[PDB]
Design an enzyme around this catalytic site. Structure first.
Site: not given
Ligand SMILES: CS(=O)(=O)Nc1cccc2[nH]ncc12
Length: 290
Positions: A136, A17-19, A22
């Site tokens: 990324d 979960k985060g940016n 999820s």
């Protein structure tokens, strides 16, 4: 099958979960008998119009990739009576490479790190044949199938190069993993295969630091920069540091030959960085010798 009906998709576990989104672990069981396929299901954290469009592009990119070292697209699930979207992927049980390095050090040696390095390089060569820039590349976005196999994941920041040009200018990036970025990405927002090669250099660094206490890239860069700095001052110092050949140190136990690869990936001159094909060949040659 790329179908996936919401009523047969059963929750098992919350994963990351985060940016942006999820991910959950689910079981797909059409035959209603408690025996089906285990999958990873990616959802938006906040379902705005902008995020939906991005999520759609991420899905198109993932669907276009078929390679041993890239996480498999399985399908989509149009949940909420087809008024919502979820991405279905294969389940890799050992989580991110970042966590695995921390949790399973008992089963990791230098030979395994070189195997992972090579597999990441192969995945990245494949991306380049589609003119996709990952943007990324980091151990948190690499997934571990088993002790012998890793796959590149999270294509949320991934971009396609235009017809002719070799760089993509990202107009206005939000939260940025600045400590993995090449100088030209920091100073000009220019992303290319060559900037993925810079980031790969930092992934190689992460591997050989074994994600130990305060050896990670942000922590080491902050040490060199000055831990009292905050805000844009950090970025100002990071840029100036990088432009005059400040670099992450050789991690303890890391061979010189592996540190030389890192330092060749971290060339300020974009054209002098190795290609992913050069790197895969060199790494497999190092492995094969011994
Ligand atoms: C990185 S994470 O812990 O959020 N989980 C995953 C993301 C994408 C595909 C995946 N397959 N399996 C797990 C997983």
């Amino acid at each position: 099958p790329t179908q996936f009906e919401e009523r047969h998709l059963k929750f098992l576990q919350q994963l990351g979960k985060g940016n942006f989104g999820s991910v959950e672990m689910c079981r797909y069981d059409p035959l209603q008998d408690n025996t089906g396929e285990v999958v990873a299901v990616k959802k938006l954290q906040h379902s705005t119009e902008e995020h939906l469009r991005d999520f759609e592009r991420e899905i198109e990119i993932l669907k276009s990739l078929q390679h041993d070292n890239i996480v498999k697209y399985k399908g989509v699930c149009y949940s909420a009576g087809r008024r919502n979207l979820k991405l279905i992927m294969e389940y890799l049980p050992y989580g991110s490479l970042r966590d695995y390095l921390q949790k399973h050090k008992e089963r990791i040696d230098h030979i395994k790190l070189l195997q992972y390095t090579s597999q990441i390089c192969k995945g990245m060569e494949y991306l380049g044949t589609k003119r996709y820039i990952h943007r990324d590349l980091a151990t948190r976005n690499i997934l571990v199938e088993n002790e012998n196999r890793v796959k590149i994941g999270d294509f949320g920041l991934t971009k396609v190069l235009p017809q002719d040009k070799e760089f993509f200018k990202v107009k206005e990036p939000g939260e940025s993993p600045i400590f993995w970025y090449a100088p030209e990405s920091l100073t000009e927002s220019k992303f290319s295969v060559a900037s993925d090669v810079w980031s790969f250099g930092v992934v190689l660094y992460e591997l050989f630091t074994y994600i130990e206490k305060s050896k990670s890239p942000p922590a080491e860069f902050m040490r060199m920069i000055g831990n009292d700095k905050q805000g844009q001052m950090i970025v100002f110092h990071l840029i100036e540091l990088l432009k005059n050949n400040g670099r992450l140190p050789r991690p303890d136990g890391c061979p010189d030959e592996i540190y030389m690869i890192m330092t060749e990936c971290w060339n300020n001159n974009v054209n002098q960085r190795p290609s992913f094909r050069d790197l895969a060949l060199r790494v497999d040659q190092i492995r094969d010798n011994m």
